[PDB]
């Protein structure tokens, strides 16, 4: 039920968090 949907949203949140972290890291790497 809603718990599996919550788990999937958790995974999406974590993936996007790492992606933004590396995005900003490489943005800083030039600036």
């Amino acid at each position: 039920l809603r718990q599996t949907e919550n788990r999937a949203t958790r995974c999406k949140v974590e993936r996007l968090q790492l992606l933004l972290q590396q995005k900003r890291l490489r943005r800083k790497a030039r600036r």
Binding site: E5, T9, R10, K12, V13, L16, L20, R24
Partner: protein
């Protein structure tokens, strides 16, 4: 909300909650990562209105900022066509105000299909419009 938290997003008496959570998004406006953090704290709630407001908050946070990744797209697409006209009614609007000037075909390809289905009120259809 920021700081104490969980206090002006509760005692808002049911339906108003859906907007109170969205307030968070407007405080973390143009701030995608901080949005993500604070909103995700509130994105997992026992009651539907909080989750709808959190999805709308993600949409607001991503409004005006064209992130190369698509946090709004992912989070709010999981909840478009959901089996409740309240998570639909926040996710659709979040996508609408997150990708406004975008004109992307991949978000319309997900939104247009939801105006027509037995499981949609005039509210959901109008917000999809």
């Amino acid at each position: 909300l920021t700081d104490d938290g969980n206090k002006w997003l509760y005692k808002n008496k049911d339906h108003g909650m859906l907007s109170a959570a969205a307030s968070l998004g407007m405080i973390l406006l143009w701030d995608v990562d901080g949005g993500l953090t604070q909103i995700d704290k509130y994105l997992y709630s026992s009651e539907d209105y909080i989750k709808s407001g959190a999805l709308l908050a993600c949409g607001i946070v991503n409004s005006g900022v064209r992130n190369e990744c698509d946090p709004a797209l992912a989070l709010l697409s999981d909840y478009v066509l959901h089996n409740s006209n309240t998570m639909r009614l926040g996710s659709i609007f979040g996508l609408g105000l997150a990708y406004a000037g975008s004109n992307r075909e991949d978000v319309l390809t997900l939104l247009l299909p939801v105006m027509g289905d037995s499981k949609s009120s005039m509210e959901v259809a109008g917000v999809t419009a």
